[PDB]
């Protein structure tokens, strides 16, 4: 297993790269091995748990989960107070 952020994601093409806790060797990702809410996407600075496989392109995040990280949205901005 591996843990890591998400640098990029290209959610078009269902592909992209996490920086993994592990001392980051750039894994790639790709939409089939990502496992989400229906979605099979990641967002950029997002945190993620995944597996390191084999790839073409080297080191290929399997089942990847999607940590989030920051999960403080829609609590300020507008109103933070009763």
């Not at 592990?22 to 997002?46: M, P, W």
Request: zero cysteines.
């Amino acid at each position: 297993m591996a843990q890591g952020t998400v640098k990029w994601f290209n959610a078009e093409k269902g592909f992209g790269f996490i920086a993994p806790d592990d001392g980051s060797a750039d894994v790639f990702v790709h939409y089939s091995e990502i496992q989400g809410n229906g979605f099979r996407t990641l967002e950029e600075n997002q945190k993620v748990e995944f597996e390191i496989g084999e790839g073409a392109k080297g080191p290929q995040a399997q089942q990847v989960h999607a940590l989030g990280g920051e999960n403080l949205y829609f609590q300020g901005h507008h109103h933070h107070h009763h």
